[PDB]
Amino acid sequence: SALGKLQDVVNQNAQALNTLVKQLSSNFGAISSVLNDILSRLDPPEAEV
Amino acid sequence: DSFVIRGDEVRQIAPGQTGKIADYNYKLPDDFTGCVIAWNSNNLDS
Structure with a gap:
């Protein structure tokens, strides 16, 4: 923890980027978080929504 | 666009x-x- 000031910057950047990537697996209310599934199992009128 | 269709569908x-x-x-x-716009035309076609 001597160089903790330099290590915290790296840790914070990596953690924020990991969170940003992991946000891609959330539904946000849709039926599935995978785009291809919800565009290849629904009609375009409901695929839009 | 004018044409004829069934009662259903x-x-x-x-x-x-x-x-x-x-x-x-x-x-x-x-x-x-x-x-x-839909309107019945049976007696004019049947």
Whole structure:
């Protein structure tokens, strides 16, 4: 923890980027978080929504 | 656009509606803007 000031910057950047990537697996209310599934199992009128 | 259809399947004429008529005969676009008018013409055709 001597160089903790330099290590915290790296840790914070990596953690924020990991969170940003992991946000891609959330539904946000849709039926599935995978785009291809919800565009290849629904009609375009409901695929839009 | 004027033509004749059955008593049922008239609901297939709409943006993004499935059905044999809507899939092979007369498909409305999804972003359609306008009106659909249906009225019985049996005694003029039957």
